[PDB]
Structures are given as structure tokens and as C-alpha cells.
Design a protein around this ligand. Structure first.
Ligand SMILES: *[C@@H]1O[C@H](CO)[C@@H](O[C@@H]2O[C@H](CO)[C@@H](O)[C@H](O)[C@H]2NC(C)=O)[C@H](O)[C@H]1NC(C)=O
Lengths: 55, 175
């Protein structure tokens, strides 16, 4: 349908810090945002299958 | 056969023995029968069980791992992944494939070795008290019953007990 595009962005905000916004227009602000506690890395496995309730 | 046991002077293997890997075939006055040497067989199995263990147990170094995660404006880095990933696959396949081929030759030869040493252990106990056929058998010059033959297997065989019986049986044929 629509001709124009929609570029998204992100960063991670420290536990004791403030994010500050300022906009004249052309803007899409957050409603919700996520709590992240990261430990270790893995990846995005590409498979067609669904969960087999095992380990 | 490296030691000239299995392919060599013992052409074929006793199929009726199903107690151990290596053993004996008595045919004396009381009857015939197979009887396996469990003590030498046990050391072989202890050994082989340990080889196979050692080939798996030493590679315990393995960790976390992953798959692929780059966009088509970073195909150069994706090609660097491929080089490495294909590279290891080549090494591991080769090292594995050969390791099998190498440890399989020596495993077979370890059995040859055990059999030639068993035949040699019998041969050294009864020097002139029996006749080396060359089919890996031993014809006795004297009568040795079922209670006498446990001494050969056990390895407690007295040379002096049956010395004169054989020695003076030897000149009878030598005419
Ligand atoms: C975001 O909120 C936190 C709330 O803790 C602010 O941190 C406090 O600032 C006061 C006032 O100077 C200090 O006494 C303490 O360092 C913090 N208070 C407590 C109770 O920990 C923080 O300043 C705000 N962050 C920014 C970047 O403005």
C-alpha cells in the first residue's frame, strides 16, 4: 500500500540513566519498552520445526 | 598378520570356542573339547575398552556454538565464516577418518600379538616333551590326561615329571 518508509532505531539505557527526546515532527515515539538482563550469547536458528517438549 | 599368527601359521579360527578371544583345543584319551584362556582375553579387552574410551574421552574439549547471521551487504564476512567452518570440517573429517584407519590396523595386530605370545608361552614350558606341528598344535610324546592339561593352561607344567617318558619314546621312532 504505502509509498513512504519507516526507519526504526534502538539503544540500551543504563540502570541509573535518562533518555531525553526532542521532536519537531515526523516522529514515532515508544509506548512500551523491555527489561533486559543479558548473560551469554547464542543465535537465531533457522528451522521450520515446532517444539517437541523434551530436553 | 604382523606377528604371523592369524593370517599366518594358524590358518583360520576355532568357531566352536565362544568363551573368549584366544584359546585351546584338547583331544586326549577322555575326549575332545575347546577351552578358552580367559586371563589373556581379559587383558585384551581391558586394553581395547581403554583405546576406545581414550579416543572419545580426550576430545571432552567442546563448548558453545552457533550458525549464520549476516546481511547481503556483508557477504565478505559471511565468506570468512564459510572459510573457517569449511576449514574445520576438512580437518576433523581427515583426522577422524585416518585415526580410525590407523588405530584399526594396530588393533588387529594387537590380537595377532596376543595369540603369538600365548603359543610361545605354551612352547617354552614343554621344550622336547612335545612336537611342533606347524599348524600351531602340539603332539605329546607322553600320555597327558584332563588333570595333566590344566597344568599347561594354568602354566604349572612340570618338565621333570614327564621327561624320561618322552625322551625314550623319541629313539623308538628314530630307527
Ligand atoms: C535518574 O533517576 C535516578 C534515581 O535514583 C537519579 O539518581 C539519583 O540522583 C540523586 C540526586 O543527585 C543522587 O543523590 C543519587 O546519585 C541518586 N539517588 C539515589 C536514591 O540513588 C539519576 O540522577 C537520574 N539520572 C540522570 C542521568 O539524571
Amino acid at each position: 500500500g504505502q509509498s513512504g518508509r519507516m526507519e526504526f532505531f534502538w539503544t540500551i539505557l543504563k540502570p541509573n540513566d535518562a533518555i531525553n527526546f526532542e521532536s519537531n515532527g515526523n516522529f514515532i515515539a515508544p509506548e512500551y519498552a523491555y527489561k533486559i538482563v543479558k548473560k551469554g550469547d547464542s543465535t537465531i536458528m533457522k528451522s521450520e520445526l515446532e517444539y517437541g517438549n523434551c530436553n | 598378520g604382523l606377528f604371523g599368527a592369524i593370517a599366518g601359521f594358524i590358518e583360520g579360527g576355532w568357531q566352536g570356542m565362544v568363551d573368549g578371544w584366544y584359546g585351546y583345543h584338547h583331544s586326549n584319551e577322555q575326549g575332545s573339547g575347546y577351552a578358552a584362556d580367559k586371563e589373556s582375553t581379559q587383558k585384551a579387552i581391558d586394553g581395547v575398552t581403554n583405546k576406545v574410551n581414550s579416543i572419545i574421552d580426550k576430545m571432552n574439549t567442546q563448548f558453545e556454538a552457533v550458525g549464520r547471521e549476516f546481511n547481503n551487504l556483508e557477504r565478505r564476512i559471511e565468506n570468512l565464516n564459510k572459510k573457517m567452518e569449511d576449514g574445520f570440517l576438512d580437518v576433523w573429517t581427515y583426522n577422524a577418518e585416518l585415526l580410525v584407519l590407523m588405530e584399526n590396523e594396530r588393533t588387529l595386530d594387537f590380537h595377532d600379538s596376543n595369540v603369538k605370545n600365548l603359543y610361545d608361552k605354551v612352547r617354552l614350558q614343554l621344550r622336547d616333551n612335545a612336537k611342533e606341528l606347524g599348524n600351531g598344535c602340539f603332539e605329546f610324546y607322553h600320555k597327558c590326561d584332563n588333570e595333566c592339561m590344566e597344568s599347561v593352561r594354568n602354566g604349572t607344567y612340570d618338565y621333570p615329571q614327564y621327561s624320561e617318558e618322552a625322551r625314550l619314546k623319541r629313539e623308538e621312532i628314530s630307527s
